Design goal:
- 2 copies of one chain form a homodimer.
- By secondary structure, chain A is mainly α.
- Chain A contains 8 helices and no strands.
- In chain A, helix 1 runs antiparallel to helix 2, helix 2 packs across helix 4 and helix 4 runs antiparallel to helix 5.
- Chain A starts with 17 loop residues before the first helix and ends in a 9-residue tail after the last helix.
- At the A-B interface, helix 2 and helix 6 of A face helix 2 and helix 6 of B.
- Bound molecules: the ligand CCCCCCCCCCCCC/C=C/[C@@H](O)[C@H](CO[C@@H]1O[C@H](COS(=O)(=O)O)[C@H](O)[C@H](OS(=O)(=O)O)[C@H]1O)NC(=O)CCCCCCCCCCC (2 copies).
- Chains A, B: InterPro entries: GLTP_sf, Glycolipid_transfer_prot_dom.
- Chains A, B: Monomer.
Chain lengths: 207, 207
């Protein structure tokens, strides 16, 4: 699945076309279902909601919103002082954190990071991803909820199986496809984070 | 708010009309927002989803589905062995548990139940409601998530204020209106639970 929906390579000008980006990331919310528990359903819903919101804005005028940069710059001009805590800019501000979670989690698994005492769990990998992508934007109650939910995570072997079901491939081949996916995905997420910095569109509030 | 949307009294035959029931309970999901935290948003969404699902079935043929009993009996006949774990029957099987939670929580608050050490919290009341209505249908991970989320609950004084905002009433008057609401609400929920028993439509699985 993951490598059937590669993100586009980054052009020299590092502009990310909105339409194709949304099409690519729209295949990611089911990722959380390969975890195999309803504890992950509200997570899938929040990420899906960001995508829907960005698409809704884009759809008002696909030309005006041709790139993600166009979204931020247009909304900055359209709105007053509520920006960047509004519209597709806010939706993408949160979406990028979820996309980063997925990135760091997968890279960690591919890099062979594991608890040597429990090498068939993915807790260490998910925890690292959470710390790096999301933790600092959650109050202590939400952080407590994450720690609890992590117990729902599947066995690594089963998780990787779920990502390749039907394909009849080895775990080694599965990890190769994940690595391929991570190239343009990681590059794209980095560019989005950098855009947020350049545009002064990043906010640090906790929920 | 609560007592502006009283449930209908129960007729002698204890049949509950589907249309008016759905109209009444459709005012309850915002209840969870008077708690004043996004930790409660996924809860509001699950309860809303049950309501939407029941309404969707009803809307296919309001006459056929005139009462909640009609829903169970019609679906039992329509479906095979997947019933009652299907359709509006399953949706109502879960909705009733949420409605019972709300009932027990409110009754507990009105009955003056409190932790004498922390009398302005509503933790004891919510915990009682959870134990009585939902706990046994949750695995340990979800139960852990509830304990954590309960820390998000507001102060009692603030919760009751939120329920009467704009009305300029005393807490004593607010509690009187809640008590009024609880009469036909409690009666109706009891009848639904009893119907589930009579129809052998209740399932005891955990999530
Ligand atoms: C009785 C049963 C037990 C109780 C159950 C309690 C449930 C606990 C629920 C915890 C929350 C679930 C996950 C959701 C988290 C979200 O609060 C945050 C912030 O969400 C943003 O809030 C914003 C609020 O706007 S503001 O008021 O103006 O500030 C916006 O709504 C924004 O959406 S937008 O499109 O409209 O722009 C929205 O994403 N979301 C996240 O943290 C992202 C979640 C991604 C997680 C990545 C994967 C990790 C999951 C663990 C996997 C091991
Ligand atoms: C990184 C961020 C941190 C991680 C966040 C993790 C999020 C944790 C989420 C925990 C779950 C949130 C609450 C939802 C609970 C639901 O799983 C259960 C069961 O739901 C049912 O499942 C069913 C599954 O069907 S089956 O597969 O065939 O079995 C159906 O989907 C059914 O819907 S239906 O309309 O389609 O029929 C549906 O209600 N719901 C509940 O427990 C009810 C929740 C009401 C709670 C009442 C208020 C208490 C809240 C605490 C307040 C102090």
């Amino acid at each position: 699945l993951l490598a059937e929906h590669l993100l586009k390579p980054l052009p020299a000008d590092k502009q990310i076309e909105t339409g194709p980006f949304l099409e690519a990331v729209s295949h990611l919310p089911p990722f959380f279902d390969c975890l195999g528990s309803p504890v992950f359903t509200p997570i899938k819903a929040d990420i899906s909601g960001n995508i829907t919101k960005i698409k809704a804005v884009y759809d008002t005028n696909p030309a005006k919103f041709r790139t993600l940069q166009n979204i931020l710059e247009v909304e900055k001009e359209m709105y007053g002082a509520e920006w960047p805590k509004v519209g597709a800019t806010l939706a993408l501000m949160w979406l990028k954190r979820g996309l980063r979670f997925i990135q760091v989690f997968l890279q960690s698994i591919c890099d062979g990071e594991r608890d040597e005492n429990h090498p068939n769990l993915i807790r260490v990998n998910a925890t690292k991803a959470y710390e790096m992508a999301l933790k600092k934007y959650h109050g202590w109650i939400v952080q407590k909820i994450f720690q609890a939910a992590l117990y729902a995570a599947p066995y690594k072997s089963d998780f990787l199986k779920a990502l390749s079901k039907g394909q009849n491939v080895t775990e080694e081949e599965c990890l190769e496809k994940i690595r391929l996916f991570l190239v343009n995905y990681t590059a794209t997420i980095d560019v989005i984070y950098e855009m947020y910095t350049q545009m002064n569109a990043e906010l640090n509030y906790k929920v």
